[PDB]
Design a protein around this ligand. Structure first.
Ligand SMILES: [Ca+2]
Ligand SMILES: [Ca+2]
Ligand SMILES: [Ca+2]
Ligand SMILES: [Ca+2]
Length: 628
C-alpha cells in the first residue's frame, strides 16, 4: 500500500535528509518530513495510497543563507502510488523493485534510457537478495551479483531496442522479474550549409531539425491554394522542424494551453506566385488527453486571430532588425520596435527581431480576419545602415470582410485540419520533465507520434500564395539568385516557434509568464533570429556546403551475449551513397544481400563487421564486438 522513495546520501553527506512531496497531496510544509536512515545506509520515506501522483524534492532542511541544499533544484521527481524508487549516488531516479517485501533485480541506469555509444554499461543490483540472473534480448539466464555489469547494446545495429530482464528470489521464495527497455540510437551526418554574408551567428539546427534538407530549395510548380495537399510532397520541404517543442512544454504544467507547434515548411513557385505549405502539429491528444481543450479541435489556430509572419530576404545585402517606420499626417516621422506589437486588442509585450538578413515581412493572421494584413518592405535605411519596415509603402493583403475571404493584391490563404507528413517526430517525455536543450539531444525520448496514435485530422495546415509582383521579383530571379524565407508563429506578439527553428524561441521557455506563472514567458519576450533562413530557388553565392560522407549503420539484431547455436542476424544500412551499395560481412575477418545470418557454434568473443562500397568506390566500414 502506497509508495516509497529512497535516497543515497553517500555523496551529499547531509546530516538530515528531508523529503517534500507535492501533487495529489502535500506531505508537510517545506522542507517536508524526515526520511529514515536504514541499515542499508539508504534513507527511506513512505507515502500512503492517497498520494497517488507526486513529485519528490530531497533537501537537507537548512534554510537559505544557512547552508540549504536540495535535489532537484526545480521540479520534483515523479513518484506514483504503487512505485518504489531510489535516487542513486550518481543522481539517477531509478526503479528499486516494488513497495513490498519481495526480492527484485534492478538497474542503476533509469529504465527507457537512450544512448548513442556502441554499448551502455548498466550496473546491476539486488534488493533483498544476493544472487540474481539476467537475460538480454531473450538470452539464456545468466548469474549475476551486486556490482556486475551488462553491455547493453553491444554488437547491435543502431536505432534498436534492447530488452533486459532481471530475475530474483527472496527469503519469501517469491520469484520476481523486472523487464527493462533501452534504445541504442544512431544518427547519420546530414549535409548542411551556411554562408557568412547573411549575418547569421547560430548554425542551422540539425538532428531532427533541418534547413533545406538534402538541398531541397523548393520546387518549380503551379500550386492550387485550396485546402488540399495532393499538390505537395516531402521533396518540397525547405525547413523541417519537430513536434512538441513549443514553449509551453517547458513549463511544469502548461499542457492545458493552446499549442503553437510548427512542424514543416514547404515552398514552390511558378511565374505568378511564391507558394507555401505550413504544417502545424497538435500532439496534446497523446501527451496529455486529460487537458480537454488543448487535446481537441478547440485548439485549432484559427479559433482566434493571432499574428503569423513569413519573413523573407529578397535583397540579400539588406539587414532589417524588425524596427518599423512611418509618417503622420503632418509629415513627422515615427518608429515602432516591430511592425505589430501592442496593437488593437493585444496589450501584451513581445516581438521577434532579426540579426540574420531579412528585408520583407508578410504579416498575416491565423484565421484571416485582420483587415490590416500587409506585406512590409524594409525600404528605408536607418542611421546605423540597418533598414526599417515602412508603414507608408506596405502592400495591403487583408480581407475586406472575414466571411468573404477576399484578400487584396492577389494574396491567397486557406487553412484546414490535415497532415502532409507521414511521420511526426518529437520528444514524448512525461509532462514537466522537459529540460532546456533536449531538442538537440539525439538520446532524448524521441518518438514518431504516428506510432503513438497520431491522426491526420489532429494537425493543421496553411496553404499560401504570395504574388511575385508584390515582392519585386520574377521566376527567373528565384531560380538564379534565390531568396530566403522563415515562418514565425506567435501567441499574440512574441514568437513561439519558427521554421527553420531558431533557439531564441526557447531561450526563456521555462520562465514564468507575467500574467499567469503557469504559462511560458516566451509569449511576451523579445526574440532575435540568428540562424540562416531557408533558401528558395538558389543558394547564397558564398555558401560553404558540408557534404555528409557515405556511411553505414551496422550490427546484430540481438544483443551480445546470446547462446551457442542461436542464429544472429547481421544487418547493414547505408547513407549518402551513390548508386548500388555492395556489403561484405565478416566474422573474425572471415566472410559470411543487405543482411546475413550467422550462427556461432563455439563460445567466445567475436568480431563482426561489414565493408560497404558504393558505385563511386566510396567505402565505409563498421566493426563491433559480439560475445557468446
Ligand atoms: Ca493544394
Ligand atoms: Ca514545432
Ligand atoms: Ca525567447
Ligand atoms: Ca518568444
Amino acid at each position: 500500500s502506497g509508495s516509497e522513495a529512497y535516497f543515497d546520501n553517500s555523496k551529499y553527506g547531509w546530516k538530515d535528509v528531508y523529503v517534500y512531496a507535492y501533487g495529489t497531496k502535500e506531505n508537510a510544509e517545506w522542507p517536508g518530513e524526515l526520511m529514515t536512515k536504514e541499515d542499508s545506509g539508504l534513507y527511506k520515506a513512505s507515502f500512503a495510497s492517497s498520494f497517488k501522483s507526486e513529485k519528490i524534492i530531497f533537501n537537507n532542511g537548512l534554510e537559505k543563507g544557512n547552508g540549504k541544499e536540495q535535489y532537484p533544484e526545480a521540479a520534483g521527481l515523479s513518484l506514483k502510488a504503487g512505485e518504489c524508487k531510489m535516487l542513486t549516488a550518481e543522481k539517477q531516479w531509478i526503479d528499486y523493485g516494488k513497495p513490498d517485501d519481495h526480492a527484485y533485480g534492478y538497474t542503476l541506469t533509469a529504465n527507457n534510457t537512450a544512448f548513442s555509444t556502441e554499448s551502455l554499461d548498466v550496473k546491476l543490483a539486488l534488493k533483498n537478495a544476493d544472487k540474481g540472473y539476467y537475460s538480454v534480448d531473450g538470452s539464456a539466464k545468466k548469474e549475476f551479483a551486486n556490482g556486475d555489469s551488462v553491455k547493453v547494446g553491444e554488437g547491435k545495429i543502431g536505432n534498436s531496442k534492447v530488452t533486459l530482464t532481471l530475475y530474483a528470489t527472496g527469503a519469501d521464495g517469491v520469484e520476481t522479474e523486472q523487464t527493462y527497455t533501452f534504445k541504442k540510437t544512431f544518427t547519420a551526418s546530414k549535409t548542411t550549409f551556411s554562408a557568412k554574408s547573411d549575418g547569421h551567428t547560430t548554425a542551422p539546427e540539425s538532428g531532427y531539425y533541418g534547413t533545406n534538407p538534402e538541398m531541397q530549395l523548393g520546387k518549380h510548380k503551379t500550386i492550387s491554394v485550396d485546402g488540399d495537399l495532393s499538390d505537395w510532397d516531402s521533396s518540397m520541404i525547405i525547413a523541417q522542424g519537430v513536434a512538441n517543442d513549443d514553449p509551453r512544454v517547458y513549463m511544469p504544467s502548461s499542457m492545458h494551453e493552446q499549442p503553437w507547434d510548427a512542424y514543416a515548411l514547404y515552398s514552390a513557385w511558378d511565374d505568378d506566385n511564391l507558394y507555401f505549405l505550413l504544417e502545424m502539429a497538435n500532439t496534446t491528444y497523446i501527451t496529455s488527453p486529460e487537458d480537454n481543450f488543448a487535446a481537441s479541435n478547440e485548439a485549432r489556430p484559427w479559433r482566434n486571430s493571432i499574428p503569423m509572419y513569413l519573413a523573407l530576404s529578397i535583397d540579400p545585402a539588406k539587414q532589417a532588425t524588425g524596427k518599423a517606420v512611418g509618417t503622420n499626417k503632418d509629415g513627422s516621422v515615427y518608429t515602432n520596435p516591430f511592425v505589430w506589437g501592442c496593437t488593437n486588442g493585444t496589450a501584451k509585450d513581445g516581438g521577434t527581431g532579426f540579426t540574420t538578413h531579412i528585408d520583407t515581412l508578410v504579416a498575416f493572421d491565423s484565421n484571416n480576419s485582420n483587415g490590416g494584413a500587409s506585406i512590409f518592405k524594409a525600404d528605408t535605411q536607418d542611421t546605423d545602415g540597418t533598414y526599417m519596415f515602412n508603414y507608408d509603402t506596405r502592400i495591403p493583403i487583408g480581407v475586406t470582410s472575414f466571411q468573404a475571404q477576399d484578400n487584396k493584391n492577389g494574396f491567397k490563404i486557406k487553412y484546414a485540419n490535415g497532415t502532409k507528413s507521414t511521420s511526426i517526430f518529437g520528444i514524448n517525455a512525461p509532462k514537466g520533465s522537459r529540460v532546456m536543450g533536449d531538442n538537440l539531444d539525439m538520446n532524448s525520448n524521441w518518438v514518431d507520434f504516428f506510432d503513438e496514435g497520431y491522426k491526420n485530422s489532429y494537425g493543421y495546415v496553411y496553404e499560401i500564395a504570395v504574388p511575385l509582383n508584390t515582392l519585386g521579383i520574377d521566376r527567373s530571379y528565384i531560380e538564379t539568385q534565390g531568396i530566403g524565407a522563415m515562418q514565425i508563429l506567435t501567441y499574440g506578439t512574441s514568437g513561439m516557434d519558427t521554421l527553420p527553428h531558431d533557439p531564441s524561441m526557447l531561450d526563456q521557455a521555462n520562465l514564468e509568464y507575467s500574467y499567469d506563472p503557469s504559462t511560458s514567458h516566451e509569449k511576451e519576450d523579445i526574440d532575435n533570429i540568428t540562424v540562416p533562413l531557408a533558401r528558395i530557388g538558389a543558394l547564397l553565392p558564398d555558401t560553404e556546403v558540408n557534404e555528409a560522407p557515405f556511411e553505414v549503420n551496422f550490427g546484430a539484431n540481438l544483443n551480445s551475449g546470446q547462446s551457442a547455436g542461436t542464429p544472429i542476424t547481421l544487418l547493414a544500412e547505408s547513407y549518402h551513397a551513390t548508386g548500388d551499395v555492395t556489403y561484405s560481412f565478416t566474422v573474425n575477418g572471415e566472410t559470411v544481400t543487405d543482411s546475413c545470418v550467422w550462427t556461432p557454434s563455439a563460445d567466445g568473443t567475436y568480431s563482426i563487421g561489414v565493408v560497404a562500397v558504393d558505385a563511386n568506390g566510396n567505402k565505409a566500414e563498421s566493426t563491433k564486438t559480439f560475445v557468446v
